[PDB]
Amino acid sequence: NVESFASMLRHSPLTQMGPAKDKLVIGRIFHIVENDLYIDFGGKFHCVCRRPEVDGEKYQKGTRVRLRLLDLELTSRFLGATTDTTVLEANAVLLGIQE
Amino acid sequence: TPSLRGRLARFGNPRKPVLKPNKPLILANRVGERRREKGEATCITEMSVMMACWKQNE
């Protein structure tokens, strides 16, 4: 009784989410470059968000944050291109920390 | 962004062309240089005031 890939995909939380627009997710900061926080929220691509002015020092590596996803991946096809140009990162708004 | 469907003269496009670009409508990997603004003669009003006062005061 081995679970199939279709069963795993059907019950996966990412599939259960549906469209990623305006969905609250829980991300984990894994890299910080000055004021840029690179947050992984379980999607294929991480998001990059500016360190908030309030409680800026409270954001460290491994911090759990509440993000509002706008897109799992930022892609757009431009004039004359044959394939969509992707920046290899998601689009999310950093709300704050989750306790 | 303006539509490009059915604009250029192409096979299968029945209508006459709308756009006739001299260069392919393909994005380049560079932007135009920071074009300078041609300098205009300055302080003309103050020069005029000074010269009018010179004319009045010999």
Eight-class DSSP state of B56: H
Tokens of A34: 């000055």
Q: Which helix (H) or strand (E) holds A5?
A: helix A5-10
Q: B27: which chain A residues are within 8 Å (Cβ-Cβ)? A: 78-81
Q: Tokens 């004021």 belong to which residue?
A: A35
| Residue A79 near chain B (CB below 8 Å) | yes
Note whether A78 contacts B24, CB cutoff 8 Å.
no
Resolution limit in angstroms?
3.1
Q: How many CB atoms lie within 10 A of CB B21?
A: 10
Method: cryo-EM
Q: B25: which chain A residues are within 8 Å (Cβ-Cβ)? A: 79-80
